[PDB]
Design an enzyme around this catalytic site. Sequence first.
Site, mmCIF file in Angstrom:
data_model
loop_
_atom_site.group_PDB
_atom_site.id
_atom_site.type_symbol
_atom_site.label_atom_id
_atom_site.label_comp_id
_atom_site.label_asym_id
_atom_site.label_seq_id
_atom_site.Cartn_x
_atom_site.Cartn_y
_atom_site.Cartn_z
ATOM 1 N N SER A 1 4.553 2.539 8.407
ATOM 2 C CA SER A 1 4.329 1.213 7.823
ATOM 3 C C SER A 1 5.635 0.734 7.216
ATOM 4 C CB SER A 1 3.254 1.253 6.723
ATOM 5 O OG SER A 1 3.645 2.093 5.644
ATOM 6 N N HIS B 1 0.835 -1.203 0.000
ATOM 7 C CA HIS B 1 0.000 0.000 0.000
ATOM 8 C C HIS B 1 0.866 1.249 0.000
ATOM 9 C CE1 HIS B 1 0.292 0.057 4.578
ATOM 10 N NE2 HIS B 1 0.278 1.361 4.349
ATOM 11 N N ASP C 1 0.115 -7.553 1.555
ATOM 12 C CA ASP C 1 0.570 -6.163 1.601
ATOM 13 C C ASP C 1 2.091 -6.112 1.815
ATOM 14 O OD1 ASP C 1 0.167 -3.441 1.449
ATOM 15 O OD2 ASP C 1 -0.375 -3.181 3.580
ATOM 16 N N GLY D 1 2.954 6.886 8.332
ATOM 17 C CA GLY D 1 4.267 7.054 7.731
ATOM 18 C C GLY D 1 5.299 6.042 8.232
HETATM 19 C C1 LIG Z 1 -1.401 4.658 10.982
HETATM 20 C C2 LIG Z 1 -0.360 4.049 10.377
HETATM 21 C C3 LIG Z 1 -0.438 2.734 9.718
HETATM 22 C C4 LIG Z 1 0.800 1.930 9.421
HETATM 23 C C5 LIG Z 1 -0.016 2.493 8.247
HETATM 24 N N1 LIG Z 1 -0.822 1.561 7.485
HETATM 25 C C6 LIG Z 1 -2.076 1.894 7.022
HETATM 26 O O1 LIG Z 1 -2.494 3.051 6.930
HETATM 27 C C7 LIG Z 1 -2.956 0.690 6.671
HETATM 28 C C8 LIG Z 1 -3.095 0.598 5.135
HETATM 29 C C9 LIG Z 1 -4.524 0.071 4.966
HETATM 30 O O2 LIG Z 1 -4.611 -1.279 5.490
HETATM 31 C C10 LIG Z 1 -4.291 -2.378 4.709
HETATM 32 C C11 LIG Z 1 -3.996 -2.192 3.265
HETATM 33 C C12 LIG Z 1 -3.691 -3.298 2.521
HETATM 34 C C13 LIG Z 1 -3.432 -3.237 1.129
HETATM 35 C C14 LIG Z 1 -3.062 -4.320 0.349
HETATM 36 S S1 LIG Z 1 -2.883 -3.801 -1.278
HETATM 37 C C15 LIG Z 1 -3.301 -2.198 -0.803
HETATM 38 N N2 LIG Z 1 -3.396 -1.125 -1.665
HETATM 39 C C16 LIG Z 1 -3.477 -1.205 -3.048
HETATM 40 O O3 LIG Z 1 -3.457 -2.296 -3.659
HETATM 41 C C17 LIG Z 1 -3.615 0.180 -3.718
HETATM 42 C C18 LIG Z 1 -2.836 0.277 -5.025
HETATM 43 C C19 LIG Z 1 -5.092 0.528 -3.946
HETATM 44 N N3 LIG Z 1 -3.571 -2.039 0.468
HETATM 45 N N4 LIG Z 1 -3.656 -4.543 3.133
HETATM 46 C C20 LIG Z 1 -3.917 -4.816 4.460
HETATM 47 C C21 LIG Z 1 -3.871 -6.064 5.001
HETATM 48 BR BR1 LIG Z 1 -3.387 -7.540 3.874
HETATM 49 C C22 LIG Z 1 -4.185 -6.305 6.416
HETATM 50 O O4 LIG Z 1 -4.105 -7.649 6.809
HETATM 51 C C23 LIG Z 1 -4.402 -8.003 8.181
HETATM 52 C C24 LIG Z 1 -4.520 -5.241 7.226
HETATM 53 C C25 LIG Z 1 -4.586 -3.826 6.750
HETATM 54 C C26 LIG Z 1 -4.263 -3.623 5.286
HETATM 55 C C27 LIG Z 1 -5.260 0.909 5.988
HETATM 56 N N5 LIG Z 1 -4.325 0.932 7.123
HETATM 57 C C28 LIG Z 1 -4.579 1.192 8.470
HETATM 58 O O5 LIG Z 1 -3.667 1.228 9.284
HETATM 59 C C29 LIG Z 1 -6.040 1.453 8.910
HETATM 60 N N6 LIG Z 1 -6.363 0.458 9.892
HETATM 61 C C30 LIG Z 1 -6.921 -0.718 9.531
HETATM 62 O O6 LIG Z 1 -7.189 -1.034 8.383
HETATM 63 O O7 LIG Z 1 -7.162 -1.476 10.624
HETATM 64 C C31 LIG Z 1 -6.395 -2.635 10.801
HETATM 65 C C32 LIG Z 1 -6.817 -3.828 9.991
HETATM 66 C C33 LIG Z 1 -6.027 -4.937 10.679
HETATM 67 C C34 LIG Z 1 -5.906 -4.488 12.132
HETATM 68 C C35 LIG Z 1 -6.663 -3.175 12.195
HETATM 69 C C36 LIG Z 1 -6.302 2.917 9.403
HETATM 70 C C37 LIG Z 1 -5.475 3.298 10.652
HETATM 71 C C38 LIG Z 1 -5.976 3.924 8.259
HETATM 72 C C39 LIG Z 1 -7.789 3.079 9.768
HETATM 73 C C40 LIG Z 1 0.691 3.555 7.377
HETATM 74 O O8 LIG Z 1 1.450 4.407 7.930
HETATM 75 O O9 LIG Z 1 0.512 3.521 6.091
#
Ligand SMILES: C=C[C@@H]1C[C@]1(NC(=O)[C@@H]1C[C@@H](Oc2cc(-c3csc(NC(=O)C(C)C)n3)nc3c(Br)c(OC)ccc23)CN1C(=O)[C@@H](NC(=O)OC1CCCC1)C(C)(C)C)C(=O)O
Lengths: 182, 13
Positions: free
Chosen positions: A139, A57, A81, A137
């Site tokens: 992740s 992501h 991810d 920021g």
């Molecule tokens: C606050 C900071 C947190 C660390 C952080 N992460 C993030 O911002 C992550 C990215 C996105 O979450 C995921 C994205 C993708 C993902 C895969 S492909 C993709 N995107 C694409 O393909 C695009 C091209 C469209 N996204 N895969 C995931 C998977 Br698999 C999970 O498995 C358990 C759990 C969350 C996932 C939202 N998020 C979160 O942290 C979000 N939380 C959230 O989704 O809650 C989690 C789910 C598991 C435990 C609780 C929130 C804080 C924004 C609400 C960051 O800094 O980015």
Amino acid sequence: APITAYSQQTRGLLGCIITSLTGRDKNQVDGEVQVLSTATQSFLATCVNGVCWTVYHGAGSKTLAGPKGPITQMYTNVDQDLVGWPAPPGARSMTPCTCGSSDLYLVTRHADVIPVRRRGDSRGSLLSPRPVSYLKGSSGGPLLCPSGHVVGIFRAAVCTRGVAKAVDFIPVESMETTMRAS
Amino acid sequence: KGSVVIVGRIILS
Ligand SMILES: C=C[C@@H]1C[C@]1(NC(=O)[C@@H]1C[C@@H](Oc2cc(-c3csc(NC(=O)C(C)C)n3)nc3c(Br)c(OC)ccc23)CN1C(=O)[C@@H](NC(=O)OC1CCCC1)C(C)(C)C)C(=O)O
Ligand code: NA
């Protein structure tokens, strides 16, 4: 806590825009964790056994700017991810933790070290909650056991009304699976 | 087509 960290910046706004376009980064690489950026987002990569791992992501399918030009991903797993590029030379490669400890430490992009309580394979409770904005920021950042070995990388925050009480991470075991499957 | 770029690093101890 046992583990400490600090950061060093290496590039600014203009240099990042340019290096993104050319795909060529001649800067000397160092450290266990790289701070990464694209046009829209910032995130981290943890280098483990010669591969620098981060989240899909964040990096999508993109190359990483390297000294010989862009580096192609060696591992790409959209559903977990997780992506990994061959680690640039100066990157300090960390060792996977296999004993699995109870107390974990999350390293953030700010180089703060946050105590975490493991709650299962891919979940960890923050001993004290933090604002979501504080973790954003970071992740791809490492969760380490006290020994300094890597147990997983930060994937998502468990939060309510802007407050995070726990983190979801990709376990090093997942990195095994992806490498083997490829 | 844009590459991901290293803009900093973190050193552990
Ligand atoms: C606050 C900071 C947190 C660390 C952080 N992460 C993030 O911002 C992550 C990215 C996105 O979450 C995921 C994205 C993708 C993902 C895969 S492909 C993709 N995107 C694409 O393909 C695009 C091209 C469209 N996204 N895969 C995931 C998977 Br698999 C999970 O498995 C358990 C759990 C969350 C996932 C939202 N998020 C979160 O942290 C979000 N939380 C959230 O989704 O809650 C989690 C789910 C598991 C435990 C609780 C929130 C804080 C924004 C609400 C960051 O800094 O980015
Ligand atoms: Na620090």
